[PDB]
RNA sequence: UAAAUCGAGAG
């Protein structure tokens, strides 16, 4: 129950939705909102913070259509992963250079 | 020894109904020592 | 929520609550500052149920 | 249409020195998030090792125990946070602490007058003996079954000169010490890192030719390391712009007002990253990437 | 440079360590009780006691 | 924050009447929950945490013949600091009837304290 | 009271320098920013946990109740 | 368990 879909603020067919994940913060959400606003089907990406106190975290995806929000979210994460991979490539192999 | 004069520093002890003073000079108080007891904290 | 002392019946006021987890202060928002006339350097104020 | 493969095309990690206590390299090429988010998962969700509970047996010194066992808790470890798993705060308190999580570290010194000191002379080293407690006294006690994995790493902290306490004779200290793993949001004691901050590369942009003294002037109004000379026309130019704290003193001169621009880069980083003493730099960014990726990956593995 | 005072360490922290054993050093704290101490102290000494 | 509290027996006796009331634990039947705190002179160990509503020093009572026990009358809890004995400049071998416990409380500052 | 084990702003360790900036400041003649520096203190957050410390336990251990005086 | 008088403060 680390994420959620809130369905008080979707939308019927799933192309707008908002999402709440548990115990983040500023760190993982404008990563996974820089990254998800890169994919070209989503047209309103956010992210809020209910209470600073609170570890609540709200990502807003609205879709142009022809692809679910959940599956946009996925995405997003997909290319979050991978471009942690590729920096930690880089690092790795650069490191050793010197 | 579970007592300290607060004067002369030196370490007594005192009996049941026995008097409240330090035998060893003329003071009559006694801090209590601290013995050897766990005590938990943390360090926050 | 009151302040005293009530100068006049806008400083005694009807707010919803809610429940925050963490500190021992009542939290309000900036907009009832001069509706209180209120500070944040120690004013202290009541709740009644 | 972007996409990884052209991030990774574009991007690219140039290192300008290296250490076991600082490290400092660029990281260009990149959105401001994603540099924000290795900034703030470095100090914040790297695990590390620091004192949690503090049992204390007898403490006659002049410091109350709640702040001896805070700077306990403060004092960094020199132990690799991957050699012990984590702790289950919702099992009993008996059955909490076991070899695979908890370190027990001791601290027993007491204070005694030494007759030898040496007559009309205040050095509290030659008066008293045990006088100063220092990091180095929290002998480390294995238990269980790690008297084996840990021979070879002994278990003294990264700075063994800390200066605890203060004893006097007859005063005591006497306490052991479970240590246990946990992420620096929680406090900061358990943070791994000094500091690990990075700054967008300073831009300066010689709008017009200053040739002349001006420029030997326009020279003064930096740092040594980033405004040279050309040989033939006395005209400045950037050497590099790295070693260029933004002071912005040339403004303050109304010679130069129009004559230099200075921005910042749009996604060039220098990270410059201090390590507490438990692991690397390079280790601590290398721990911050790879905590991102698990997390999105746990997260994606989320049934919404 | 010329508004320059100074941490005076060194000459705070051995005085930390080793109290005087002369005369107490900062005179300008004991005049600042003056009226107390020298009025106390004009009861009974002084002139015809 | 320190804070001193005279816990003292000799308030219900004058003119010479005998203490009816002796520091320590009595030989009655008492339960011995009581030992967290107080040690077999009825005193606090030095350097406890003391909630609120555990004892602080238990006095054997003559007029009833049954253990009684003081508590800490306080919302904030404490360490017990430091104890005095104090005694009584009189000719008599009179028992020991005034203490003054020292407590320190722990005051982190918390969202609201007024710098 | 005592030295802090850390500086409060960025957390470098700065709970071993107190004695040695003693030292650099009476065995070796160094003004007070020379002897931060020579310490490894740049930033002024961590000099000034170490600059303007007094030391005060040294004035709390007189006052020893288990030794006579 | 009170209630007064004097003093110290917060807004
Ligand atoms: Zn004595
Ligand atoms: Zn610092």
């Known amino acids: 129950e680390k994420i959620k879909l809130l369905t008080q603020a979707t939308s019927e067919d799933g192309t707008s939705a908002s999402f709440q994940i548990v115990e983040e913060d500023h760190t993982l959400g404008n990563a996974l909102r820089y990254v998800i606003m890169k994919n070209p089907d989503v047209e309103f990406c956010g992210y809020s913070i209910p209470h600073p106190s609170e570890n609540l975290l709200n990502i807003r995806i609205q879709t142009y259509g022809e692809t679910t929000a959940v599956d946009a979210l996925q995405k997003g994460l997909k290319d979050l992963m991978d471009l942690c991979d590729v920096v930690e490539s880089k690092f790795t192999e650069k490191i050793k250079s010197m | 020894l579970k007592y300290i004069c607060a004067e002369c520093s030196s370490k007594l002890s005192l009996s049941r109904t026995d008097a409240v003073r330090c035998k060893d000079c003329g003071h009559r108080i006694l801090l209590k020592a601290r013995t050897k007891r766990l005590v938990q904290f943390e360090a926050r | 929520m009151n302040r005293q002392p009530t100068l006049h019946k806008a400083s005694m006021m009807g707010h919803k609550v809610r429940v925050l987890p963490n500190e021992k202060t009542l939290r309000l928002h900036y907009a009832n500052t001069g509706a209180y006339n209120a500070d944040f350097d120690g004013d202290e104020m009541n709740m009644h149920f | 249409e972007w996409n990884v493969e052209k991030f990774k095309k574009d991007f690219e990690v140039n290192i300008s020195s290296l250490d076991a206590r600082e490290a400092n390299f660029d990281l260009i090429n990149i959105d401001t998030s994603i540099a924000n988010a290795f900034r703030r998962i470095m100090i914040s969700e790297v695990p590390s090792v620091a004192a949690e509970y503090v049992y204390f047996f007898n403490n006659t010194s002049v410091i109350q125990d709640e702040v001896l066992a805070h700077r306990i808790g403060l004092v960094p470890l020199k132990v690799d946070p991957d050699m012990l798993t984590w702790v289950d705060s919702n099992l009993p308190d008996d059955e909490k602490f076991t070899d695979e999580n908890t370190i027990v570290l001791s601290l027993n010194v007491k204070c005694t007058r030494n007759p030898d000191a040496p007559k009309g002379s205040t050095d509290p080293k030659e008066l008293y003996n045990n006088a100063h407690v220092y990091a180095r006294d929290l002998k480390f006690e294995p238990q269980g079954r790690q008297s084996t994995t840990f021979a070879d790493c002994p278990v003294v902290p990264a700075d063994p000169d800390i200066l605890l306490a203060k004893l006097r004779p007859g005063q005591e200290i006497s306490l052991k010490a479970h240590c246990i793993l946990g992420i620096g949001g929680d406090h900061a004691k358990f943070s791994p890192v000094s500091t690990a901050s990075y700054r967008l590369l300073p831009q300066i942009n010689i709008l017009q030719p200053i040739k002349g003294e001006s420029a030997r002037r326009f020279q003064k109004c930096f740092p040594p390391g980033v405004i040279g000379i050309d040989e033939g026309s006395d005209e400045a130019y950037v050497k590099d712009a790295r070693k260029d704290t933004v002071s912005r003193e040339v403004l303050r001169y109304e010679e130069f007002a129009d004559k230099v621009k200075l921005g910042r880069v749009r996604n060039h980083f220098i990270f410059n990253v201090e390590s507490a003493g438990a692991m690397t730099p390079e280790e601590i960014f290398f721990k911050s990437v790879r905590i991102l990726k698990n997390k999105a990956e746990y997260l994606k593995n989320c049934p919404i | 440079q010329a508004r320059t005072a100074d941490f005076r360490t060194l000459e705070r922290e051995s005085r930390f360590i080793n109290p005087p054993k002369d005369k107490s050093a900062f005179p300008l704290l004991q005049e600042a009780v003056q009226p107390h101490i020298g009025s106390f102290n004009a009861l009974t000494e002084g002139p015809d006691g | 924050m320190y804070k001193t509290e005279k816990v003292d027996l000799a308030l219900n006796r004058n003119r010479g009447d005998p203490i009816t009331q002796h520091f320590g634990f009595g030989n009655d039947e008492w339960p011995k929950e009581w030992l967290e705190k107080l040690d077999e002179d009825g005193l606090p160990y030095i350097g406890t945490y003391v909630e609120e509503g555990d004892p602080i020093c238990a006095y054997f009572d003559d007029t009833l013949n049954k253990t009684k026990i003081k508590t800490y009358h306080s919302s904030e809890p404490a360490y017990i600091e430091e104890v005095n004995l104090i005694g009584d400049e009189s000719n008599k071998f009179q028992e020991l009837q005034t203490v003054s416990i020292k407590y320190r409380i722990r005051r982190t500052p918390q969202i609201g304290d007024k710098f | ?69």
């Open chain 7, 1 to 69: 009271m005592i030295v802090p084990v850390r500086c409060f702003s960025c957390g470098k360790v700065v709970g071993d320098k107190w004695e040695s900036y003693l030292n650099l400041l009476q065995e070796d003649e160094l003004d007070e920013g020379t002897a931060l520096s020579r310490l490894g203190l740049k930033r002024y957050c961590c000099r000034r946990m170490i600059l303007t410390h007094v030391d005060l336990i040294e004035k709390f251990l007189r006052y020893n109740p288990l030794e006579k005086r």
